[PDB]
Paper text:
Here, we determine the high-resolution structures of cyclic di-pyrimidine-synthesizing cGAS/DncV-like nucleotidyltransferases (CD-NTases) in clade E (CdnE) in its apo, substrate-, and intermediate-bound states. CD-NTases share an N-terminal core domain with templated and non-templated polymerases of the nucleotidyltransferase (NTase) superfamily, but the C-terminal helical domain shows a higher degree of variation.
The native structure of LpCdnE was refined to 2.46-Å resolution. It differs from ClCdnE in similar regions, with 1.32 Å RMSD for 276 Cα pairs, but the α1-α2 loop is missing. The four protein models, two from LpCdnE-UTP and two from LpCdnE-UMPnPP complex show RMSD of 0.56 Å to 0.82 Å from the native LpCdnE for 281 to 286 matched Cα pairs.
Numbering used by the authors: 2 to 16, 21 to 297
Amino acid sequence: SIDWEQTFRKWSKPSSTKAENAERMIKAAINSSQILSTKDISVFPQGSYRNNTNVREDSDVDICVCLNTLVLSDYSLVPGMNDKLAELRTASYTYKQFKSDLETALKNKFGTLGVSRGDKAFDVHANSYRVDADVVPAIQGRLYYDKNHNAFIRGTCIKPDSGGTIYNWPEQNYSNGVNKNKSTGNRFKLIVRAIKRLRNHLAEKGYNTAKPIPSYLMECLVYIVPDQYFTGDSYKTNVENCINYLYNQIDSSDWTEINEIKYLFGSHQMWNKTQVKEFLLTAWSYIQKNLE
């Protein structure tokens, strides 16, 4: 027997200074770089630690280092919009030089043994500064919605070493999560944590359906569930409402990420709605009562 109400209430508990320490140490690594200290660079958390949805004690902090003066624009929505109308200035400093200089600064502060270069981010681990971070080099990304040099949504843009382009909207993710947590009486992020820990519990116990469901996907999926299903006094009922809605609405769905900009499913995502439906069925079966 399992008191799933009690288990979901315990799994909804939050963790505060980890993200702040990571940001401060990466910022200090940048400020000690001669070339990067003069640049217009922002350092800020993103992901679960930013959104207060982190549930694993040993998970890395997602830190974004954004060079704000390099701009990459998505013109797909506005016919006629281009660099000329957007007043894009040509720049000598490139994304590769920025990433290489950031790698040099990270190695300078934290040591080469603690810095590893990946396709998208740097894996940083330095116990001397208590830093366990995924540090993403990004530039200013824009999504225009009108033929006007200011009519755009601003986020971050990543150029992986293996080619291609990626757009992130960390501020939008954060603010949308904050607003949904406000309109649900802080139950939204509680249920996010509970369901993420449910997925982790299922993955550790060998359920294959829980393996390809990462944290950000869970946060997006739970954000999609309407607010009416987060009311009441039973956390288990909220989890079951979320699973029911997501399971019976996903086939006809045309959902977006929590930023309400990027589509949740598509060629740009490594997940598909079949995996999500299978995981939802597994979780539902796992939490039911009187099941032999």
